[PDB]
Amino acid sequence: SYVHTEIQNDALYITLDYPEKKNGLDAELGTSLLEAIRAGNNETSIHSIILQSKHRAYFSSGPRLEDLLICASDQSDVRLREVLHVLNHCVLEIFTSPKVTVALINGYAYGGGFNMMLACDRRIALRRAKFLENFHKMGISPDLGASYFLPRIIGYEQTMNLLLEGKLFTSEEALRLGLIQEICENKQELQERVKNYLKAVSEGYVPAIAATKKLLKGKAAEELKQQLEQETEELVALFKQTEIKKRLEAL
């Protein structure tokens, strides 16, 4: 099972555990992740869903260049549409969760490997965490909700600049931009911080939390759903163009 699940004190922990691809995003992990998010969402008794990685070195490597290359080489678009469908549903199901959603970024989180977590209510990173948005050099458009979330979180102009620079950036920079909400210095502090955070969530009333999130989001989930569809079409179109195959090959 590409992801592990456990409920403790009325909170669901979803742990990415896919060493073969370093927590990479493909159709199989995606399907397993989606199932887990949906189970948490449908679980009346929990108040929170925590997304995390089991592996010290990384949170998620994101979509794998090797896997993308296969999609570029595929002339049917089926492989590409397949993986995007599942991962897009993961993003949407996180975004529309009635539970308080938190992502714990312990290690590096590249591309969609970070971006999917932008759908969470809060993102907390270890100091050592590193981030990367590499669409520009790859010759592709942003996906997995990135075109929706980035401008809304950090602003359009800063999004264009972040994508243009395509740098490995620090947790400090991510905090400054508002991509993440806070930084913990080490594993133990993160562990304590999370415990305290969930204690605070538990003092609320589950249906009130759900209504609150619903009201705050308003028409956003409808907008995101539409944007995910547009991202899909733009990316598929680009993946039919030789330049994209060439860049993926080179990489």
The nearer residue to a second copy, 39 or 238, going by C-beta atoms, is 238
Nearest distance, CB of residue 58 and a second copy, angstroms = 23
Nearest distance, CB of residue 124 and a second copy, angstroms = 11
Nearest distance, CB of residue 113 and a second copy, angstroms = 19
What residue ranges bind a second copy (CB under 8 A)?
100, 121-123, 135-142, 147-148, 150-151, 153, 155-161, 163-166, 178, 181, 197, 200-201, 203-205, 207-209, 211-218, 223, 227, 230-231, 234, 237-238, 241, 243-244, 247
The nearer residue to a second copy, 29 or 138, going by C-beta atoms, is 138
At 74, the amino acid letter reads: D
Cα gap 113→93, rounded to integer Å: 16
Nearest distance, CB of residue 54 and a second copy, angstroms = 25
Task: Write the DSSP symbol of residue 63.
Answer: S
Nearest distance, CB of residue 48 and a second copy, angstroms = 10
Question: Count of CB atoms within 10 A of residue 83's CB?
Answer: 24
- Tell me the CA end-to-end span of the chain in Å, nearest whole number: 29
Q: Residue 40: CB partners within 8 Å, gap ≥ 6?
A: 5, 12, 14, 46, 49, 97, 99
The nearer residue to a second copy, 165 or 249, going by C-beta atoms, is 165
108-110: strand order across its sheet? 58-60, 108-110, 130-132, 169-170
The nearer residue to a second copy, 20 or 223, going by C-beta atoms, is 223
Question: Count of CB atoms within 10 A of residue 165's CB?
Answer: 10
Angle at 143 between CA 137 and CA 145, to 5 degrees: 135
